[PDB]
């Protein structure tokens, strides 16, 4: 499961006293300290969305809660001194802090079937309306090659691979939803298929 | 920005049929084929969630979602035919992979604030802010820092700073404690160091 994270911390001028003591024994500033402390923290998250609100007289929000946490470090880091002044406004911050939580993905599905919906508890249209109501688009595959000609001995026999396949539904699912089918009925064609999904969905 | 996209597919022992013409001109079942186009779709995505449905007389539910797109090719790459029997759930693969976004709808809400500082200025107030976060489901974690009294040599002789006298602790321990969160003071970096540690293994 993943968490949503916000990072506020602090600007103010006294951020530049060199307070911090390391193992070595040196002294750095405290906004140096956090920002290594603070770094190793945004890379230890990986599957959580993180943000970042810088604070004092004013406060204002430098990340807006991203899943890519390369960037809300990259932005801390480069983050300097004295910019906001002497004096913090911790409210501010926390309730900026809240605001972003409310202010923040997109949802796709991709159903891939070979036939018709044989044995279920709930309908395939049913569902496709309960996705719509979660705003999940469907885009859906059917798959096989359908009739091909064998020539043979006497004369003309025709197999066909995929009769099971209910295009039918598979269209409503995917009109319903606002989504497109598709029909593959080769390796090759299939490919496309799934090349062209992803270009719909940048 | 992020896309959240649940792959569904069929395992039903109809898929075991080779119809699938490949580029080279020879034949192949169709869950091999799948295998193949979905796995390099896959590695195509960046920066979206996904997740594995798989379908036959029941459906369940094999990756929940990730940034590792890797678990969810590997899950599919093992995955073999006739388990799931002959028929197909449409429905339930789809009810299924709906219902996996609404655990996507639960985030837990987390804030950090670290301070030197009273909150000397500001229009809105610290625990009503506090408050705030109570409402919309926020633990809110507090990190005092400052090393507190401090004997230093100046120029002119030895002389004892005390570093954090505006720290305002108790404003920062009534906040996360409002919240549910914890408060914690750094006197030094190896502290601060080992503060968000803390925090990390709080929220898991
Ligand atoms: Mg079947
Ligand atoms: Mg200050």
């Known amino acids: 499961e993943h968490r949503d994270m916000m990072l506020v911390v602090d600007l103010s001028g006294s951020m530049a006293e060199e307070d911090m003591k390391t193992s070595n024994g040196d002294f750095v500033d405290r906004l140096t300290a ?11 998250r990986k599957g959580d969305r993180l943000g970042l609100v810088l604070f004092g007289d004013h406060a204002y929000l430098q990340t807006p809660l991203t899943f890519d946490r390369n960037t809300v470090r990259e932005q801390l880091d480069r983050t300097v001194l004295n910019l906001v002044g002497q004096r913090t406004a911790i409210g501010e911050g926390l309730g900026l802090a809240t605001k972003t939580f409310i ?100």
């Open 34 to 44: 956090v920002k290594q402390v603070v770094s190793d923290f945004i890379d230890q």
């Open 103 to 202: 202010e923040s993905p997109q949802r796709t599905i991709i159903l891939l079937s070979d036939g018709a919906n044989t044995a279920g508890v709930l309908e395939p249209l049913e569902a496709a309306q309960l996705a719509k109501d979660n705003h999940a688009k469907i885009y859906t595959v059917g798959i096989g090659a359908g009739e091909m000609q064998v020539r043979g001995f006497f004369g003309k026999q025709t197999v066909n691979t995929a009769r099971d396949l209910d295009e039918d539904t598979l269209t409503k699912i995917a009109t319903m939803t606002g989504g497109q089918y598709f029909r593959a009925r080769n390796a090759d064609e299939l490919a496309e298929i799934y090349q062209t999904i992803d270009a719909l969905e940048p």
